[PDB]
């Protein structure tokens, strides 16, 4: 429900977004406002936005 996995690698193009690799796990913190979600990376602990078409629920 709130734990998601990256399906593809992604390199951030803004200071606000996270970069990640395929298979990295995230905790979602706010998915209410649009199709970019606020998340916390379970590898780095960093929080920022991720594109929701790049992740799926575990």
């Amino acid at each position: 429900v709130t734990l998601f996995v990256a399906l593809y690698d992604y390199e951030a193009r803004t200071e606000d977004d996270l970069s990640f690799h395929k298979g990295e796990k995230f905790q979602i913190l706010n998915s209410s406002e649009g199709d970019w979600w606020e998340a916390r990376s379970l590898t780095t602990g960093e929080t920022g936005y991720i594109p929701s078409n790049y992740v799926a629920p575990v």
Partner: peptide
Amino acid sequence: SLARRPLPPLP
């Protein structure tokens, strides 16, 4: 706002 930007294409 950051949430409502267009999504990137899938690879």
